[PDB]
Amino acid sequence: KSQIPRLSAINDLHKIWPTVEEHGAAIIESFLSLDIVRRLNEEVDPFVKIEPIPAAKTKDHPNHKLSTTTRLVNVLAPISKAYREDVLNSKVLHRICSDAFHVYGDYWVLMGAVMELAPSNPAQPLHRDMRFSHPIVEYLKPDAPATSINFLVALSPFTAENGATHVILGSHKWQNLSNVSMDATVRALMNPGDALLITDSTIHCGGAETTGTETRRLLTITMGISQLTPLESNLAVPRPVIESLTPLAQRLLGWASQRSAAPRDIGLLTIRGNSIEKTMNLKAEQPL
Amino acid sequence: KSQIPRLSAINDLHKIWPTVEEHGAAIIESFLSLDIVRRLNEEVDPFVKIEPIPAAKTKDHPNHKLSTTTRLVNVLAPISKAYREDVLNSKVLHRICSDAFHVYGDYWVLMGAVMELAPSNPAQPLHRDMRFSHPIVEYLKPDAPATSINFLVALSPFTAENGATHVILGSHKWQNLSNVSMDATVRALMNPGDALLITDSTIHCGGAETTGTETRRLLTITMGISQLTPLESNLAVPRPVIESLTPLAQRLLGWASQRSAAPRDIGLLTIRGNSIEKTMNLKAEQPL
Ligand SMILES: CN1C(=O)c2ccccc2NC(=O)[C@@H]1Cc1ccccc1
Ligand SMILES: CN1C(=O)c2ccccc2NC(=O)[C@@H]1Cc1ccccc1
Ligand SMILES: O=C(O)CCC(=O)C(=O)O
Ligand SMILES: O=C(O)CCC(=O)C(=O)O
Ligand code: NI
Ligand code: NI
């Protein structure tokens, strides 16, 4: 069985989305530089350490799907300069997203999260993303272009033994799911900064951590059309942080109005014919 | 040809959604009391008068679809006490919406707007709503439950001669649109406070104002699943106004997290497993 296609962020940029459209997955080598990875890791470190279990009794939106050996930290903009500057303005990310979502219009971040898996973390069940938040997605016709995609960026090594993600190539086009098996999977073996890119229809799962010693960490960026509601809110992010961002990053975080691709688009999140940013006189690129 | 079914808000409440599901439209008689209509009208009056043309050159999200004799004012919560208290907490509205959207989960306001049509306003072309903002909707399978519905509430009389809305009954189930004609329509003749309820697949249009003297006004409330992005933003609504609302009204305006109907729903607009309202310590029902 064929392995996940591997592509250069630098040279193969126009090939990335076509590859995912065909195969349902691709590895983007050096999606983030080691410097960006180092900074992201340093900045999110304490927030990962303080994060409780996904279904902690203190939470009013517990996540009952993730294992108790998973820590997931979302709403990264207030935590990480590297995320809100380097990642949210990634030229590679934006080329891919505009390639993927042009039929629909603007896209934004549905969720940007760091996931850390403790040693001995079990494999997740094979799944498609979005089914525990956006039931609407299952009602889309089979030829509807993907309405979200997920960049699973390695922040530490992904190896067979430490639970590198499994994907089923071609499963984004499956309607009948009787052949869903771990027998059908291949692995996303990755170095820090590489990214596994999948669609919302790609069947995949986190792997089993079998060493008992290694802690695997990733940055998962679910990018989706601006017509779909994010899993996470940036409503509580301080205004000085928002005003430090680029206009593009502000839009990605829901601090701007949005547009569809409809010829005479009437817009999303507008205020009596004007944008959020015009109405609220939102500054951009103001240093902290 | 059969007329639009007319139902009592008081007595026929459980019948309203089934009627719309079958026929694509229903008139809800006395949906709003005359007192609520009077207050809404008084409160929005000046904002309608100052509103420019839909595609005014001053706007960065011009609406190129509506006629130059249309004034549309959305983001009503800061303008109208009647809207944000009486309308957003309407028992009838909420029964209907929970009937309609239970398959998907929570619902919210995609747009609440007052539309005023000047004398001599022409008929709109026959259309389905949502196509100039949410192209995703056209990609839904035919048996997907409606993901949005629109309450067109009369704030003045709707007569044949003054441009009462046209609908095509049963057109919410049409796939082939070759028989779309004004020949196929019936009229929503309504008194102030009555509401025409349609789905996002019901083919309809504003009628021609033929008197040259009458000014028709309506309150259009597009309610949709919380998985779809609103056409309008309440991000700039003052915190004291938001904190005066019920928790339900806050959710409807995007000042709360949201839930899907998925068995182990992980939520929408959450912040590291907690809600917007818990995170921001958002008060409710605090008088102004
Ligand atoms: C539930 N779930 C997440 O929490 C998740 C986490 C990170 C990024 C995307 C994401 N979206 C999802 O739909 C997944 C789905 C899932 C996960 C584990 C086991 C079964 C299903
Ligand atoms: C464009 N458009 C609005 O502006 C509108 C106004 C009020 C409530 C819903 C609404 N949604 C829409 O999709 C309509 C569609 C339309 C209107 C006129 C002519 C052609 C198409
Ligand atoms: O752990 C991984 O590599 C994948 C995680 C995942 O697919 C998910 O949580 O949705
Ligand atoms: O004017 C009316 O009665 C209907 C308006 C309408 O359908 C629209 O603007 O989408
Ligand atoms: Ni997943
Ligand atoms: Ni309409």
Residue numbers in the entry:
A (entry chain A), B (entry chain A): 8 to 295
Sentences from the paper on this structure:
The non-heme FeII/α-ketoglutarate-dependent dioxygenase AsqJ from Aspergillus nidulans is an exceptional enzyme that activates dioxygen and stereoselectively catalyzes a C–C bond desaturation and epoxidation reaction. AsqJ converts its natural substrate, 4′-methoxycyclopeptin, to a quinolone alkaloid, 4′-methoxyviridicatin. The active site of AsqJ forms a funnel like reaction chamber, located at the interface between antiparallel β-strands. The substrate interacts with the active site metal, which is ligated by His-211, His-134, Asp-136, as well as by the C-2 keto group and C-1 carboxylate of α-ketoglutarate (αKG), and a crystallographic water molecule in an octahedral coordination sphere.
For comparison, we also studied the effect of the V72K, V72L, and F139I substitutions to increase the interaction between His-134 and the substrate from the opposite side. However, whereas the V72K and V72L mutants did not improve the π-stacking interactions, the F139I variant showed some minor increase in the dispersive interactions between His-134 and the surrogate. To this end, we cloned, expressed, and purified the V72I-, V72K-, and F139I-mutated AsqJ enzymes. The catalytic activities of these mutants were determined for the native substrate 1, cyclopeptine 1b, as well as for demethylcyclopeptine 1d and compared to the wild-type (wt) AsqJ by using a reverse-phase HPLC/MS-coupled activity assay, and X-ray crystallography. The wt and V72I-, V72K-, F139I-mutated AsqJ variants turned out to have similar turnover rates for the methylated substrates 1 and 1b, suggesting that these alterations do not lead to a significant decrease in the enzyme activity. In contrast, the F139I mutant only displays a minor increase in activity, whereas the turnover of V72K for 1d is similar to the wt enzyme as proposed by our MD simulations.
